[PDB]
Amino acid sequence: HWGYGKHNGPEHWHKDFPIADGERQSPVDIDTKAVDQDPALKPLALVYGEATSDRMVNNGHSFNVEYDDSEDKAVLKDGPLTGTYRLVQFHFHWGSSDDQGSEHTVDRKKYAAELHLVHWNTKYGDFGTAAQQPDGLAVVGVFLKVGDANPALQKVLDALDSIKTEGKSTDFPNFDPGSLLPNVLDYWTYPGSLTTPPLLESVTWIVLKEPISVSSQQMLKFRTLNFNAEGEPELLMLANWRPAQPLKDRQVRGFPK
Ligand SMILES: [Zn+2]
Questions:
Q1: Disulfide connectivity?
Q2: Which of 15, 37, 58, 182 satisfies CB 3.0 to 4.6 Å to 163 for a cystine?
Q3: Residue 243 and residue 151: Cα distance in Å, rounded?
């Protein structure tokens, strides 16, 4: 089973998921001086006022905050997109020290962590159907820059002791995903993939230019999670980031430039 260890990690995923070596894989490094403007791009609309969080779950690879996506309660529109994309869950990637852990990088700079807000196009009826299509998924990436402690983030981290091990979940109502956004929604966008197997090439990436904050102490809490289930030897979730992949024949575009 794939993971982030020496034998089963990113370098090896290509063996069981050869699309790892595909034409539109994520993440990438964003070489900012190679970014194009495009007047067709719009401001991002993150319509999250009605969001209804459900629960938090350790899936053996990260933890997800899942949302009720049965109707348009927390949706993503505009930016580079056409149509409505519903928020299904968010999750994070991090590393084993503060100097690394983001999946996307900006002129080779790694941040301590990265938030992924995963959305699917209503045209496809549900997440699994949408994940098979080039315009099916849209993921908003937000960097966590080590600095000040973040109170909104701490509400998530306060629940982590309840989901230490794979398979555990905890109820998690009333969490406003907009509370994990920077004040400015400037972004980069490119066509890419999910960053975990099966690495499907169905994602319009929207990476926000401005990070949100996290403290060094807060980063410790991520790394208390376990990849293993309860009763198995403790495999700490010290790092769960895929490194930057080659951009190949794609163009990153930026809004407002
Ligand atoms: Zn992710």
A1: none
A2: 58
A3: 28
Q: Which of 1, 12, 14, 61 is catalytic?
A: 61
Are 52 and 67 within 8 A, CB to CB?
Answer: yes
- Tell me the pairing of strands 85-94 and 203-208: unpaired
Structure tokens that stand for 118 in this block:
């995963």
Identity of residue 70: S
Domain 1-257, second-level architecture: Roll (3.10)
Q: Which residues of 215-248 are buried (b: 16+ CB within 10 A; e: fewer)?
A: beebbebbbebbbbeeeeeebebbbbbbbbbebe
**Residue 117 Cα to ligand 1 middle (Å):** 8
**Cβ–Cβ < 8 Å for 2, 13:** yes
The rounded distance, in Å, linking the Cα atoms of 29 and 106 is 6
What's the number of CA atoms in the CB half-sphere (13 Å) around residue 128? Answer: 0
Resolution in angstroms for this experimental structure? 1.6
Please say if 61 is a catalytic residue.
yes
Alpha-carbon distance of 122 to 71, in angstroms, equals 9
Domain ranges of the chain: 1-257
Rounded to the nearest whole angstrom, what is the distance from the C-alpha of residue 2 to the centroid of ligand 1? 15
CB 83: neighbour CB atoms within 10 A? 13
23: DSSP letter: S
Q: Which residues are annotated as a binding site for substrate?
A: 195-196
How far does residue 20's CA lie from ligand 1's centre (Å)?
Answer: 15
Beta bridge partners of 77: 45
Annotated binding site for Zn(2+): 91, 93, 116
